[PDB]
Design a protein around this nucleic acid. Structure first.
Ligand SMILES: Cc1cn([C@H]2C[C@H](O)[C@@H](COP(=O)(O)OP(=O)(O)OP(=O)(O)O)O2)c(=O)[nH]c1=O
Ligand SMILES: [Ca+2]
Ligand SMILES: [Ca+2]
Ligand SMILES: [Ca+2]
Ligand SMILES: [Ca+2]
Ligand SMILES: [Ca+2]
Length: 326
DNA sequence: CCGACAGGCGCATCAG
DNA sequence: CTGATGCGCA
DNA sequence: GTCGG
Protein backbone atom coordinates (compact mmCIF):
# COMPACT_ATOMS: atom_id res chain seq x y z
CA UNK A 1 0.00 0.00 0.00
CA UNK A 2 2.93 2.47 0.32
CA UNK A 3 2.95 3.24 -3.41
CA UNK A 4 -0.26 1.37 -4.03
CA UNK A 5 -1.75 3.90 -6.41
CA UNK A 6 1.37 3.62 -8.53
CA UNK A 7 1.74 -0.16 -8.56
CA UNK A 8 -1.96 -0.63 -9.21
CA UNK A 9 -1.66 1.78 -12.13
CA UNK A 10 1.32 -0.04 -13.60
CA UNK A 11 -0.23 -3.48 -13.10
CA UNK A 12 -3.36 -2.46 -14.96
CA UNK A 13 -1.21 -1.26 -17.87
CA UNK A 14 0.66 -4.55 -17.61
CA UNK A 15 -2.60 -6.49 -17.99
CA UNK A 16 -3.59 -4.23 -20.92
CA UNK A 17 -0.41 -4.93 -22.84
CA UNK A 18 -0.75 -8.67 -22.23
CA UNK A 19 -4.46 -9.15 -22.91
CA UNK A 20 -5.14 -6.40 -25.50
CA UNK A 21 -1.93 -5.40 -27.24
CA UNK A 22 -0.63 -8.98 -26.92
CA UNK A 23 2.69 -7.38 -26.11
CA UNK A 24 4.22 -9.79 -23.65
CA UNK A 25 7.44 -7.83 -23.23
CA UNK A 26 5.63 -4.61 -22.31
CA UNK A 27 3.62 -6.65 -19.79
CA UNK A 28 6.82 -7.97 -18.18
CA UNK A 29 8.40 -4.50 -18.30
CA UNK A 30 5.46 -3.00 -16.40
CA UNK A 31 5.46 -5.91 -13.97
CA UNK A 32 9.16 -5.51 -13.30
CA UNK A 33 8.55 -1.82 -12.59
CA UNK A 34 5.63 -2.60 -10.33
CA UNK A 35 7.68 -5.18 -8.47
CA UNK A 36 10.62 -2.86 -7.85
CA UNK A 37 8.43 0.04 -6.75
CA UNK A 38 6.49 -2.17 -4.31
CA UNK A 39 9.70 -3.11 -2.48
CA UNK A 40 10.90 0.52 -2.36
CA UNK A 41 10.60 1.89 1.17
CA UNK A 42 9.84 5.59 0.59
CA UNK A 43 6.58 7.23 -0.48
CA UNK A 44 7.61 8.26 -4.01
CA UNK A 45 7.40 12.05 -4.53
CA UNK A 46 8.36 12.20 -8.22
CA UNK A 47 8.92 10.44 -11.48
CA UNK A 48 12.62 11.31 -11.45
CA UNK A 49 12.85 9.67 -8.02
CA UNK A 50 11.31 6.48 -9.45
CA UNK A 51 13.55 6.54 -12.57
CA UNK A 52 16.56 5.81 -10.31
CA UNK A 53 15.12 2.33 -9.77
CA UNK A 54 16.13 -0.41 -12.17
CA UNK A 55 13.40 -1.23 -14.65
CA UNK A 56 11.77 2.19 -14.36
CA UNK A 57 12.49 4.49 -17.33
CA UNK A 58 11.50 7.68 -19.15
CA UNK A 59 7.94 6.68 -20.00
CA UNK A 60 6.96 5.11 -16.66
CA UNK A 61 8.41 8.20 -15.02
CA UNK A 62 6.13 10.53 -17.02
CA UNK A 63 3.24 8.26 -16.06
CA UNK A 64 4.16 8.49 -12.37
CA UNK A 65 4.35 12.28 -12.76
CA UNK A 66 0.80 12.48 -14.13
CA UNK A 67 -0.51 10.15 -11.42
CA UNK A 68 1.09 12.01 -8.51
CA UNK A 69 -0.30 15.37 -9.64
CA UNK A 70 -3.82 14.44 -10.81
CA UNK A 71 -4.54 11.05 -9.18
CA UNK A 72 -5.23 9.14 -12.39
CA UNK A 73 -3.88 8.44 -15.88
CA UNK A 74 -5.38 9.62 -19.19
CA UNK A 75 -4.15 6.56 -21.10
CA UNK A 76 -6.02 4.41 -18.56
CA UNK A 77 -9.27 6.40 -18.45
CA UNK A 78 -9.54 5.90 -22.23
CA UNK A 79 -8.76 2.20 -21.87
CA UNK A 80 -11.41 1.86 -19.15
CA UNK A 81 -14.09 3.20 -21.49
CA UNK A 82 -13.10 1.29 -24.62
CA UNK A 83 -15.80 -1.42 -24.70
CA UNK A 84 -13.76 -3.82 -26.79
CA UNK A 85 -10.71 -3.57 -24.52
CA UNK A 86 -12.83 -4.20 -21.37
CA UNK A 87 -14.52 -7.17 -22.95
CA UNK A 88 -11.26 -8.77 -24.09
CA UNK A 89 -9.82 -8.06 -20.65
CA UNK A 90 -12.77 -9.63 -18.88
CA UNK A 91 -12.83 -12.91 -20.88
CA UNK A 92 -9.12 -13.65 -20.06
CA UNK A 93 -10.17 -13.85 -16.45
CA UNK A 94 -11.66 -17.21 -17.39
CA UNK A 95 -9.14 -19.95 -16.92
CA UNK A 96 -8.24 -21.27 -20.38
CA UNK A 97 -9.04 -18.15 -22.41
CA UNK A 98 -5.92 -16.15 -23.18
CA UNK A 99 -5.48 -12.91 -25.14
CA UNK A 100 -5.99 -14.70 -28.46
CA UNK A 101 -9.27 -16.58 -27.79
CA UNK A 102 -10.64 -13.58 -25.93
CA UNK A 103 -10.15 -11.42 -29.03
CA UNK A 104 -11.70 -14.11 -31.26
CA UNK A 105 -14.76 -14.46 -28.98
CA UNK A 106 -15.26 -10.69 -28.80
CA UNK A 107 -15.18 -10.46 -32.65
CA UNK A 108 -18.03 -13.00 -32.75
CA UNK A 109 -20.28 -11.08 -30.33
CA UNK A 110 -19.30 -13.04 -27.21
CA UNK A 111 -18.54 -10.33 -24.58
CA UNK A 112 -20.23 -11.36 -21.29
CA UNK A 113 -20.64 -14.20 -18.84
CA UNK A 114 -24.10 -14.85 -20.31
CA UNK A 115 -22.61 -15.05 -23.82
CA UNK A 116 -20.07 -17.59 -22.65
CA UNK A 117 -22.68 -19.55 -20.66
CA UNK A 118 -24.91 -20.08 -23.70
CA UNK A 119 -22.05 -20.80 -26.11
CA UNK A 120 -20.42 -23.70 -24.22
CA UNK A 121 -20.16 -25.47 -27.58
CA UNK A 122 -17.47 -22.97 -28.66
CA UNK A 123 -15.23 -23.47 -25.62
CA UNK A 124 -12.66 -26.24 -25.24
CA UNK A 125 -12.68 -28.46 -22.18
CA UNK A 126 -10.40 -26.24 -20.14
CA UNK A 127 -12.33 -23.11 -20.98
CA UNK A 128 -15.50 -24.84 -20.03
CA UNK A 129 -14.24 -25.86 -16.54
CA UNK A 130 -12.90 -22.31 -15.99
CA UNK A 131 -16.33 -20.91 -16.88
CA UNK A 132 -18.00 -23.47 -14.57
CA UNK A 133 -15.92 -22.40 -11.57
CA UNK A 134 -15.35 -18.82 -12.65
CA UNK A 135 -16.32 -17.17 -9.35
CA UNK A 136 -14.62 -19.82 -7.20
CA UNK A 137 -11.30 -19.52 -9.09
CA UNK A 138 -11.05 -15.87 -8.14
CA UNK A 139 -11.60 -16.39 -4.47
CA UNK A 140 -8.39 -16.69 -2.54
CA UNK A 141 -7.60 -19.68 -0.36
CA UNK A 142 -7.02 -18.86 3.29
CA UNK A 143 -3.86 -20.48 4.68
CA UNK A 144 -6.03 -22.50 7.15
CA UNK A 145 -7.69 -24.25 4.17
CA UNK A 146 -4.29 -24.71 2.47
CA UNK A 147 -3.18 -26.55 5.59
CA UNK A 148 -6.14 -28.95 5.23
CA UNK A 149 -5.57 -29.43 1.51
CA UNK A 150 -1.89 -30.23 2.22
CA UNK A 151 -2.94 -32.88 4.85
CA UNK A 152 -5.30 -34.70 2.45
CA UNK A 153 -2.82 -34.63 -0.43
CA UNK A 154 0.15 -35.88 1.64
CA UNK A 155 -1.86 -38.61 3.37
CA UNK A 156 -3.37 -39.88 0.09
CA UNK A 157 0.00 -39.75 -1.63
CA UNK A 158 1.49 -41.70 1.30
CA UNK A 159 -1.30 -44.25 0.85
CA UNK A 160 -0.43 -44.99 -2.77
CA UNK A 161 3.26 -45.49 -1.99
CA UNK A 162 5.27 -44.39 1.12
CA UNK A 163 8.27 -43.64 -1.11
CA UNK A 164 6.61 -40.57 -2.76
CA UNK A 165 7.44 -37.11 -1.47
CA UNK A 166 4.97 -34.25 -1.98
CA UNK A 167 5.84 -30.68 -1.16
CA UNK A 168 3.34 -27.85 -1.29
CA UNK A 169 5.12 -24.91 -2.90
CA UNK A 170 3.90 -21.60 -4.40
CA UNK A 171 2.95 -18.76 -2.04
CA UNK A 172 2.09 -21.33 0.71
CA UNK A 173 5.78 -22.20 1.19
CA UNK A 174 6.58 -18.46 1.14
CA UNK A 175 4.48 -18.23 4.32
CA UNK A 176 1.59 -16.26 2.80
CA UNK A 177 -1.66 -15.91 4.77
CA UNK A 178 -3.71 -16.52 1.60
CA UNK A 179 -3.00 -18.40 -1.69
CA UNK A 180 -4.36 -18.06 -5.22
CA UNK A 181 -4.10 -21.84 -5.88
CA UNK A 182 -2.17 -25.01 -4.83
CA UNK A 183 1.11 -26.24 -6.32
CA UNK A 184 2.33 -29.69 -5.54
CA UNK A 185 5.80 -30.95 -6.34
CA UNK A 186 5.89 -34.74 -6.45
CA UNK A 187 9.03 -36.90 -6.39
CA UNK A 188 9.56 -40.70 -6.38
CA UNK A 189 12.80 -42.86 -6.40
CA UNK A 190 11.78 -44.67 -9.61
CA UNK A 191 11.84 -41.39 -11.62
CA UNK A 192 15.25 -39.73 -11.99
CA UNK A 193 17.16 -37.94 -14.74
CA UNK A 194 18.66 -41.29 -15.81
CA UNK A 195 15.62 -43.57 -15.92
CA UNK A 196 11.90 -44.05 -15.42
CA UNK A 197 11.64 -47.49 -13.73
CA UNK A 198 7.85 -47.28 -13.11
CA UNK A 199 5.08 -45.83 -15.35
CA UNK A 200 1.83 -44.14 -14.15
CA UNK A 201 3.69 -42.50 -11.29
CA UNK A 202 1.71 -39.30 -11.64
CA UNK A 203 -1.48 -41.04 -12.86
CA UNK A 204 -1.87 -43.29 -9.75
CA UNK A 205 -1.63 -40.20 -7.51
CA UNK A 206 -4.30 -38.34 -9.53
CA UNK A 207 -6.52 -41.42 -9.58
CA UNK A 208 -6.24 -41.71 -5.75
CA UNK A 209 -7.05 -38.03 -5.30
CA UNK A 210 -10.07 -38.41 -7.63
CA UNK A 211 -11.17 -41.55 -5.79
CA UNK A 212 -11.55 -39.59 -2.51
CA UNK A 213 -13.33 -36.76 -4.32
CA UNK A 214 -10.49 -34.36 -3.78
CA UNK A 215 -9.69 -33.81 -7.45
CA UNK A 216 -13.08 -33.00 -8.99
CA UNK A 217 -11.87 -31.93 -12.48
CA UNK A 218 -8.97 -32.21 -14.96
CA UNK A 219 -7.80 -29.28 -17.18
CA UNK A 220 -4.78 -31.13 -18.60
CA UNK A 221 -2.69 -34.15 -17.73
CA UNK A 222 0.51 -35.60 -19.16
CA UNK A 223 3.24 -37.82 -17.77
CA UNK A 224 4.96 -35.19 -15.59
CA UNK A 225 2.38 -32.43 -15.12
CA UNK A 226 -1.23 -32.35 -13.95
CA UNK A 227 -3.39 -29.23 -13.97
CA UNK A 228 -6.83 -29.34 -12.41
CA UNK A 229 -9.40 -28.62 -9.73
CA UNK A 230 -9.82 -29.82 -6.16
CA UNK A 231 -12.13 -29.21 -3.21
CA UNK A 232 -12.19 -29.69 0.57
CA UNK A 233 -15.00 -31.87 2.00
CA UNK A 234 -17.67 -29.92 3.90
CA UNK A 235 -19.53 -30.96 7.05
CA UNK A 236 -23.36 -31.18 7.38
CA UNK A 237 -25.69 -28.18 6.82
CA UNK A 238 -22.66 -26.07 5.80
CA UNK A 239 -22.09 -24.32 2.48
CA UNK A 240 -19.60 -26.10 0.20
CA UNK A 241 -16.04 -24.68 -0.03
CA UNK A 242 -15.18 -23.09 -3.38
CA UNK A 243 -13.48 -25.29 -5.93
CA UNK A 244 -9.78 -24.59 -6.30
CA UNK A 245 -7.03 -24.65 -8.86
CA UNK A 246 -4.47 -27.34 -8.23
CA UNK A 247 -1.21 -28.08 -10.07
CA UNK A 248 0.91 -31.21 -9.54
CA UNK A 249 4.32 -31.61 -11.13
CA UNK A 250 6.29 -34.87 -11.08
CA UNK A 251 9.97 -33.94 -11.02
CA UNK A 252 13.06 -36.18 -11.20
CA UNK A 253 14.10 -36.83 -7.58
CA UNK A 254 17.76 -35.97 -8.25
CA UNK A 255 16.61 -32.58 -9.57
CA UNK A 256 14.42 -31.83 -6.57
CA UNK A 257 15.99 -28.48 -5.54
CA UNK A 258 16.01 -26.83 -8.93
CA UNK A 259 12.42 -28.06 -8.99
CA UNK A 260 11.43 -26.75 -5.59
CA UNK A 261 13.20 -23.47 -6.26
CA UNK A 262 11.14 -23.17 -9.39
CA UNK A 263 7.69 -23.89 -7.94
CA UNK A 264 8.28 -21.84 -4.83
CA UNK A 265 8.38 -18.62 -6.91
CA UNK A 266 7.30 -15.91 -7.04
CA UNK A 267 6.86 -15.63 -10.80
CA UNK A 268 8.81 -12.40 -10.96
CA UNK A 269 11.54 -13.67 -8.57
CA UNK A 270 12.18 -16.53 -10.95
CA UNK A 271 12.18 -14.24 -13.96
CA UNK A 272 14.62 -11.94 -12.18
CA UNK A 273 16.70 -14.93 -11.03
CA UNK A 274 16.80 -16.61 -14.48
CA UNK A 275 17.50 -13.19 -16.10
CA UNK A 276 20.35 -12.54 -13.65
CA UNK A 277 21.87 -16.01 -14.18
CA UNK A 278 21.80 -15.46 -17.98
CA UNK A 279 23.83 -12.26 -17.38
CA UNK A 280 26.31 -14.32 -15.29
CA UNK A 281 26.62 -17.05 -17.99
CA UNK A 282 24.23 -19.73 -16.69
CA UNK A 283 20.78 -21.04 -17.46
CA UNK A 284 18.34 -22.34 -14.89
CA UNK A 285 15.21 -24.35 -15.48
CA UNK A 286 13.05 -26.49 -13.18
CA UNK A 287 15.64 -29.25 -13.58
CA UNK A 288 19.19 -28.08 -13.67
CA UNK A 289 21.59 -25.21 -13.61
CA UNK A 290 23.96 -25.22 -16.57
CA UNK A 291 26.79 -22.92 -17.80
CA UNK A 292 26.74 -21.11 -21.14
CA UNK A 293 29.51 -21.40 -23.75
CA UNK A 294 30.15 -18.44 -26.08
CA UNK A 295 27.95 -19.88 -28.88
CA UNK A 296 24.85 -19.93 -26.63
CA UNK A 297 25.03 -23.70 -26.04
CA UNK A 298 24.16 -24.96 -22.56
CA UNK A 299 26.99 -26.87 -20.86
CA UNK A 300 26.35 -30.00 -18.83
CA UNK A 301 24.46 -29.76 -15.47
CA UNK A 302 26.33 -28.49 -12.41
CA UNK A 303 26.14 -30.42 -9.13
CA UNK A 304 23.50 -29.20 -6.68
CA UNK A 305 22.59 -30.57 -3.24
CA UNK A 306 20.60 -27.57 -1.93
CA UNK A 307 18.44 -24.59 -2.84
CA UNK A 308 21.28 -22.48 -1.44
CA UNK A 309 23.84 -23.86 -3.98
CA UNK A 310 21.81 -22.43 -6.86
CA UNK A 311 21.99 -19.00 -5.29
CA UNK A 312 25.80 -19.21 -4.93
CA UNK A 313 26.53 -19.94 -8.61
CA UNK A 314 24.91 -16.59 -9.65
CA UNK A 315 26.39 -14.60 -6.70
CA UNK A 316 23.22 -14.13 -4.64
CA UNK A 317 22.89 -14.25 -0.87
CA UNK A 318 20.42 -16.99 0.05
CA UNK A 319 16.91 -15.62 0.36
CA UNK A 320 14.42 -17.58 2.46
CA UNK A 321 11.15 -18.43 0.69
CA UNK A 322 9.40 -15.75 2.85
CA UNK A 323 11.67 -13.13 1.27
CA UNK A 324 10.93 -14.08 -2.38
CA UNK A 325 7.42 -12.69 -2.43
CA UNK A 326 6.66 -9.59 -4.51
C1' DC B 1 21.23 2.43 -30.54
C1' DC B 2 18.88 -2.30 -30.49
C1' DG B 3 18.78 -7.05 -29.32
C1' DA B 4 16.93 -9.92 -25.89
C1' DC B 5 13.73 -10.10 -22.48
C1' DA B 6 12.88 -17.60 -18.80
C1' DG B 7 11.74 -21.75 -19.81
C1' DG B 8 9.00 -25.70 -20.91
C1' DC B 9 4.46 -28.95 -20.32
C1' DG B 10 0.10 -30.26 -22.51
C1' DC B 11 -3.43 -29.29 -25.86
C1' DA B 12 -4.70 -27.82 -30.38
C1' DT B 13 -3.90 -26.97 -35.11
C1' DC B 14 -1.74 -27.30 -39.85
C1' DA B 15 1.29 -29.09 -43.60
C1' DG B 16 2.79 -33.00 -45.52
C1' DC C 1 0.85 -40.45 -38.71
C1' DT C 2 5.44 -36.95 -37.54
C1' DG C 3 7.10 -32.42 -36.95
C1' DA C 4 6.57 -27.58 -36.28
C1' DT C 5 4.18 -23.72 -34.60
C1' DG C 6 1.01 -21.14 -31.38
C1' DC C 7 -1.76 -20.74 -27.14
C1' DG C 8 -2.47 -20.53 -22.11
C1' DC C 9 -0.33 -21.16 -18.20
C1' DA C 10 3.20 -22.47 -14.62
C1' DG D 1 9.14 -0.47 -21.94
C1' DT D 2 13.85 -0.81 -20.22
C1' DC D 3 18.68 -1.79 -20.13
C1' DG D 4 23.86 -2.50 -21.21
C1' DG D 5 27.25 -3.47 -24.02
C1 LIG E 1 2.92 -18.24 -13.36
C2 LIG E 1 4.40 -18.40 -13.12
C3 LIG E 1 4.86 -19.26 -12.13
N1 LIG E 1 6.18 -19.40 -11.90
C4 LIG E 1 6.65 -20.32 -10.84
C5 LIG E 1 6.78 -19.56 -9.53
C6 LIG E 1 5.49 -19.83 -8.79
O1 LIG E 1 5.67 -19.76 -7.36
C7 LIG E 1 5.08 -21.22 -9.32
C8 LIG E 1 3.57 -21.41 -9.46
O2 LIG E 1 2.90 -20.57 -8.52
P1 LIG E 1 1.42 -19.99 -8.78
O3 LIG E 1 0.51 -21.21 -8.78
O4 LIG E 1 1.50 -18.99 -9.92
O5 LIG E 1 1.09 -19.19 -7.40
P2 LIG E 1 1.95 -17.93 -6.92
O6 LIG E 1 3.29 -18.37 -6.42
O7 LIG E 1 1.84 -16.85 -7.98
O8 LIG E 1 1.13 -17.38 -5.67
P3 LIG E 1 -0.44 -17.05 -5.72
O9 LIG E 1 -1.04 -18.39 -5.44
O10 LIG E 1 -0.53 -16.04 -4.59
O11 LIG E 1 -0.78 -16.53 -7.09
O12 LIG E 1 5.73 -21.38 -10.59
C9 LIG E 1 7.12 -18.65 -12.69
O13 LIG E 1 8.36 -18.76 -12.49
N2 LIG E 1 6.71 -17.81 -13.65
C10 LIG E 1 5.40 -17.64 -13.91
O14 LIG E 1 5.02 -16.86 -14.80
CA1 LIG F 1 16.12 3.19 -14.12
CA1 LIG G 1 -7.29 -16.93 -18.52
CA1 LIG H 1 0.30 -21.07 -6.35
CA1 LIG I 1 -0.24 -22.75 -10.01
CA1 LIG J 1 -21.02 -30.82 -5.31
Amino acid sequence: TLNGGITDMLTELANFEKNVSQAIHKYNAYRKAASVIAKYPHKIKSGAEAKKLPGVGTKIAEKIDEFLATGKLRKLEKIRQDDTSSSINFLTRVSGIGPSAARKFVDEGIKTLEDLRKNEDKLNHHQRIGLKYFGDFEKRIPREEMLQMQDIVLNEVKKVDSEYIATVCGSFRRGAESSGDMDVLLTHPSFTSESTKQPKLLHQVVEQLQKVHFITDTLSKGETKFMGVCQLPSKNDEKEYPHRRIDIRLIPKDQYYCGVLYFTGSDIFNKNMRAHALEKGFTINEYTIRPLGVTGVAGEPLPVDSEKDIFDYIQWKYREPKDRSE
